[PDB]
């Protein structure tokens, strides 16, 4: 109970068998797999009280499990389908509901790997009219044209990650909402004082970590293979 799960992130095509693994060090009899989806909370898939005992939870269809040791509880998607896209959480419990959750597995099931695509990223510079009116300066990052919706955006000032002054959209929007495999777009803002933006020594970078294909995946297109990768964009401060 350092509960650990693997993998942390995975993208897969439909029709594949996918395995998630939970391990614990405390040897608790009771282990559990849950899935989390927006608006639905954490729904129980399967759970186990010993190496000989498996019990269905509310959403066990499409999944199987194995309790191959006191320490280990494996989850399988038998034949992955897109609606199994979710954050998956394993947990253990003691005899009195003391639960320990693993840190999560973000899994995306896609129908067609040919649609995977890394983002293009651009930084938009603060407006002069903002600087004049407020003595503050807002940078905007735009990540566009990506698929699946499986990214992490962060901001980096003079080489270090910042949280203050940042807001990132909580979910990406669909570029073409009437398509089931629309590409996505995400924006973020970083606001600093005008004085800090005005210093040409200051360097600002938006970093987007994209999750896509692995070295193992086949790629038959001319365009770049859309592998997991970092895409950034940058601007320097400007005396003006």
């Amino acid at each position: 109970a350092d509960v650990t799960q693997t993998p942390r992130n995975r993208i897969t095509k439909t029709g594949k068998r996918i395995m998630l693994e939970c391990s614990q060090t405390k040897g608790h009899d009771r282990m559990y797999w849950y899935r989390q989806d927006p608006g639905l909370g954490l729904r129980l898939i399967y759970y186990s009280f010993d190496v000989k005992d498996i019990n269905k939870g509310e959403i066990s269809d499409g999944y199987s499990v194995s309790r191959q040791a006191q320490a280990k509880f494996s989850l399988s998607l038998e034949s992955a389908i897109p609606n199994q896209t979710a954050l998956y959480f394993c947990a253990t419990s003691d005899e009195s509901y003391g639960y320990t959750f693993g840190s999560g597995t973000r899994l995306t099931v896609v129908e067609d790997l040919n649609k995977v695509s890394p983002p293009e990223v651009a930084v938009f510079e603060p407006s002069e009219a903002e600087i004049s009116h407020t003595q503050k300066a807002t940078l905007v990052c735009l990540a566009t044209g990506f698929y699946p919706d499986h990214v992490e955006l962060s901001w980096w000032v003079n080489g270090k990650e910042v949280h203050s002054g940042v807001c990132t959209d909580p979910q990406p929007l669909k570029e073409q909402p009437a398509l089931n495999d629309s590409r996505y777009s995400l924006s973020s803002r970083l606001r600093v004082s005008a004085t800090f933006w005005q210093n040409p020594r200051n360097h600002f970078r938006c970093q987007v970590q994209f999750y896509g294909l692995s070295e193992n995946d086949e790629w038959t297109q001319d365009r770049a293979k859309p592998v997991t990768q970092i895409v950034s964009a940058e601007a320097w401060g400007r005396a003006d």
Partner: protein, 202 residues
């Protein structure tokens, strides 16, 4: 315990006001009850739980909840909402003597106290070019909300609150953009009800 109900997938509270997130249970025998929090990007953290001891249970950070059998409730409260309380909260219940079952969850949105709003629409230019730009609607108070686009080639984000620690300063903003030829920032937020004194530079 058969079930647990949280009402409202998204709820608001004024910065500085009492936080109250509601949870009710269905279980003839009193159950053990739990409130977990989830920060964006993260897993689950226990705030507090009822385990048939104290009826007023006190948790991390000023959180408390009172188990009320006669009204089958375990509402989570904190005396004053901070911007850092923005998170999703889950109430949970023991069931069948072998598991915890989860509520559907409620996201808490904290409306910053904006004493001096300065609503404005600004145009921002791409740092390379490729002479692209975006429009930034910013510095309106929480009586404004931003409506989604009704032109499919114009994209408009939800409002988003940033907290500049360097100046102890919070502000709302939404971003709009398009590749359309006749797109102008003057028109970008025409489908939203904006303040009558929105600044449009210049």
């Amino acid at each position: 315990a058969q079930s647990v109900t949280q009402l409202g997938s998204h709820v608001s509270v004024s910065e500085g006001a009492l936080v109250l997130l509601r949870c009710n249970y269905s279980s003839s025998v009193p159950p053990y009850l739990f409130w977990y929090v989830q920060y964006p990007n993260q897993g689950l953290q226990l705030l507090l739980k009822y385990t048939s001891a104290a009826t007023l249970v006190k948790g991390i950070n000023g959180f408390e909840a009172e188990f009320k059998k006669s009204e089958t409730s375990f509402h989570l409260t904190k005396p004053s909402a901070h911007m850092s309380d923005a998170a999703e909260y889950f109430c949970a219940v023991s069931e069948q003597d072998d598991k915890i079952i989860f509520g559907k969850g409620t996201r808490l949105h904290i409306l910053p106290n904006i004493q001096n709003p300065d609503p404005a629409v600004y145009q921002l230019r791409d740092s390379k070019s490729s002479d692209k730009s975006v429009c930034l609607f910013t510095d309106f108070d929480s009586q404004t909300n931003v409506s989604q686009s009704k032109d499919s080639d114009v994209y408009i984000t939800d409002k988003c609150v940033l907290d500049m620690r360097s100046m102890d300063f919070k502000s709302n903003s939404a971003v709009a953009w398009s590749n359309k030829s006749d797109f102008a920032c003057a028109n970008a937020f025409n489908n939203s009800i904006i303040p009558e004194d929105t600044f449009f530079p210049s």
